[PDB]
Structures are given as C-alpha cells and as structure tokens.
Design a protein around this ligand. Structure first.
Ligand SMILES: Cc1cn([C@H]2C[C@H](O)[C@@H](COP(=O)(O)OP(=O)(O)O)O2)c(=O)[nH]c1=O
Ligand SMILES: *[C@@H]1O[C@H](CO)[C@@H](O)[C@H](O)[C@H]1O
Ligand SMILES: [K+]
Lengths: 401, 7
C-alpha cells in the first residue's frame, strides 16, 4: 500500500508531511511526496520519493517586496491549481489515499484528482486560525477589508475572495477530466473533514468546528548536531537561540541584530540560525555562533531560551522541549501561537514583528526567569499527543472502508 | 499565490 502526500508550502508543511510519512513507514505503508523543489534535501534525508511541484526557492517573494501586478497574481493563482492536475495523476499511481498539506487552492486541485481516481482525500492545517468559525479570525496571510475586525465577516469575505480567484480555473480543469463543478470552492479543499495537525493543549480546536484534532505531526528527530556546534555548546554556558525559520525580509535581519545585542546585555552566548535569507551575526566574537539546518528537537533541549517567529512547527518543538520561548510574530498564525506561549506561561509574546533593544530586553528578562523555565518544563509533558499516529489511523481506516 | 508573501 502507498499513500501520496502533497505539500504546497514552506519548511513547516514539508516537515508535517515528513512526520506522517515516517509513521506510515513504521506501519509498513509506502509514501510518495509532491512538494516544492526546496524539499529535495529534507526528503532525500528521510528517503521519501520526491515529485517536484511548484516554483524553486530562489523565485520566492520576501516580506517587504512589492506585490505583483494583478495579472501576475492571477497567473500564479491559476498555476497553483493547474500544476496539481498536471502532476498529481502521475504521482498518485499505485496509491490508496492522498493527504494534502499547505495551500488550500493547491488542495482543491489535489482533491479533484483524488476524486477522479476514487481515492480517499485528507487535508490538514497547522493551527485553528485556518478553520472557519466565529471564535478566531483567519490567519494573517492576505490583506483584509480595511477597518474590519468582525470575525464572521473576515471568514465570509476570505471564502468569497477564494472562490472567485480559484473557482474558474479549478472548475475548468475539473471539466476537462469529466468532473462536475464544485460550488463551495472554499470548503472543497478541506476535504470531508479537515484534520487540525496541532497539539490539543498548545493549540486547542475551537468549538463549532467540524474537524479532527489529531495532535501535532512530528517524528523523533534522531539527527546528531554537527561537531562544530556540539563543541560551541560545551565550551560555555547555555546560549540563547535565535531563529525565524522560513521568514524573510530585512525585518528579521534587524530583529536578529537587536536580539544579539539584548542577549549579550544579559551576559549570554548566542546561536543564530541563518535561515534561507542568510542572516548574519554582528561580528566574529566567540560568544556567538551561526548555524544552518540543525536538529532543533536536540538543540532546543540544550539552550537557555529560544527566540523565534511563532510558526506552528518551531513552537511545538520548543514547547515539548520545555525551553522558555520569546515569540516575535510576523504573519499567518504566528500572532495566535505567540498568544499561546503567553497563555501557558512558557515565555513571552513580543508585541509585534519589530523589536527594539528595550522591548526585546524586557521580554528576554521574563523569558530567562526561573519561573518561566519551571513552567516550560511542566507544560512540555502535556503536549506529547502523537498526531501522526492518529492521522495515519484515520487514513488507513479510510482505505479499509 | 504560490511564491510566498505576506503582502
Ligand atoms: C530551520 C529549521 C527548522 N527545523 C524544523 C523543525 C520544525 O518542526 C519544522 C517546521 O517548522 P515551522 O516553524 O512550522 O516552519 P516555517 O518556518 O516554514 O513556518 O522545521 C529544524 O529541525 N531545524 C532547522 O534548522
Ligand atoms: C504557506 O502558505 C500557505 C498559504 O497559501 C499555508 O496554507 C501554509 O501553511 C504556509 O506554510
Ligand atoms: K506560519
């Protein structure tokens, strides 16, 4: 038996897919993953066959860049849907089910091919702000009607906008392969019942939502830290780690610079993850260390604190690692996750994406307080629910039926 | 969409 995983997203979505692939493997089920070209290294690492779909990393926009002209936005919107119909049929060969993660629009195309081939389809989201309800506003991933804060309206408008932008292409491609048109375009990509791949304590499913909370989808990262990093950690006190994952733009470079300054102001060493936009340290003093891709599950248990962007994966990893967290939210579901770190008492939710030496220092002081550490350690034991295992069973149960 | 953001 083989399951097709389709990911249209960043590092975080790829890792969510990798985690499921790992649980399926343990069950004796093969997997194949359609993912952006940038997933190549990670997929090669875990031995999951990769079917490249989407633009390469060097064609990715960065926070701060001007939006593309409407004609170009429309072209990308159509591409997002059309690349699924072109690539999923081939990738689905010999598969019994299909699990999509990431972009909803891409998901409508994936579900359509699955529907054509008569294969069960599942879609997961990394947080409750991607599930429509009157309780939480949608993820901050697109501009919304100026002045509107009403949760219900934001969702209704988000859905209408989505249907209008992708509906025509979706339904045209569907018709070309004999499928009747989809009327509820926004709902269609979520599948019959979307899976909330997030921890029930860290990110609890809100009421009035028809979804299955499986728990976060993570694998036991066994990768060892690189020798040079293992040495740095030994030759000194527990440093503070800075990392903003798939974030981009000059804002994070500035934030990182301020973070190093503040960390030093508290007499602590620094470890800086370069990220794909290659963030750089202020100087070469031996009190700091820059790193590229590293096992965070391992690293996070050996640091005094972590400063990050608040994306689902990095926060879950930090949360189960029991390390105090300083969250500097920038977009999508990050303000939500930052608020979660605040509510659980495991760190500080910095107020906004642009920290100053003052605000960062105040937050850092709290984050490094013994109370916070004790609290983080405690909470770490409440977020162990194995989502991938729960998800894999749902998938198999569907194939069984 | 299909190349990041956020705008
Ligand atoms: C950057 C980076 C990420 N990670 C992994 C752990 C997380 O579960 C996973 C996804 O994190 P996530 O923050 O959700 O992704 P993004 O930054 O794209 O929003 O990335 C590492 O293990 N090491 C690294 O160096
Ligand atoms: C990348 O952005 C998509 C939206 O188009 C979101 O669904 C993913 O979770 C995110 O990583
Ligand atoms: K995110």
């Amino acid at each position: 038996m083989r399951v097709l995983l389709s990911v249209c997203g960043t590092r975080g979505d790829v890792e969510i897919g990798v985690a499921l692939a790992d649980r399926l493997k343990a069950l004796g089920v093969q997997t194949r993953m359609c993912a952006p070209p940038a997933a190549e290294e990670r997929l090669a690492e875990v031995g999951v066959p990769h079917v490249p779909v989407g633009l390469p990393q060097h064609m990715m926009l960065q926070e701060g860049m001007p939006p593309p002209p409407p004609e170009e936005e429309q072209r990308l919107a159509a591409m997002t849907v059309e690349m699924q119909f072109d690539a999923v049929p081939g990738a689905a060969e010999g598969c019994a089910a299909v699990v999509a993660v990431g972009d909803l629009a891409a998901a409508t195309g994936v579900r359509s091919v699955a529907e054509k081939l008569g294969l069960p389809f599942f879609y997961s989201v990394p947080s409750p702000v991607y599930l429509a309800s009157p309780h939480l506003p949608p993820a901050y991933d697109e501009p919304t009607t100026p002045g509107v804060t009403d949760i219900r309206v934001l969702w209704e408008e988000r859905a209408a906008r989505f249907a209008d932008r992708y509906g025509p292409t979706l339904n045209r491609r569907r018709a070309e392969i004999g499928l009747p048109p989809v009327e509820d375009v926004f709902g269609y990509g979520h599948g019959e019942r979307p899976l909330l791949a997030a921890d029930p304590v860290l990110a609890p499913l809100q009421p009035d939502v028809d979804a299955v909370q499986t728990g976060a989808w993570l694998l036991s990262d066994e990768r060892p830290l690189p020798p040079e990093l293992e040495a740095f950690l030994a030759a000194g006190s527990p440093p503070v780690h800075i990392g903003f994952g798939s974030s981009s733009g000059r804002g994070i470079a500035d934030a990182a610079k301020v973070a190093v300054e503040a960390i030093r102001a508290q007499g602590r060493r620094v470890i800086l993850s370069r990220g794909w936009t290659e963030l750089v340290l202020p100087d070469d003093r031996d009190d700091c260390f820059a790193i590229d891709e590293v096992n965070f599950q391992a690293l996070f248990r050996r640091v005094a604190a972590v400063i990050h962007h608040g994306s689902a994966g990095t926060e879950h990893v930090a949360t189960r690692a029991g390390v105090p967290q300083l969250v500097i939210p920038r977009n999508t579901d990050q303000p939500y996750f930052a608020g979660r770190v605040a509510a659980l008492g495991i760190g500080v939710a910095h107020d906004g994406p642009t920290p100053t030496f003052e605000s960062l220092s105040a937050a850092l002081t709290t984050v490094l307080a013994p109370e916070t550490r004790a609290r983080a350690e405690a909470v770490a034991g409440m977020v162990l629910t194995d989502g991938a295992a729960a998800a894999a069973d749902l998938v198999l149960a569907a194939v069984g039926r | 969409x299909x190349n990041x953001x956020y705008x």
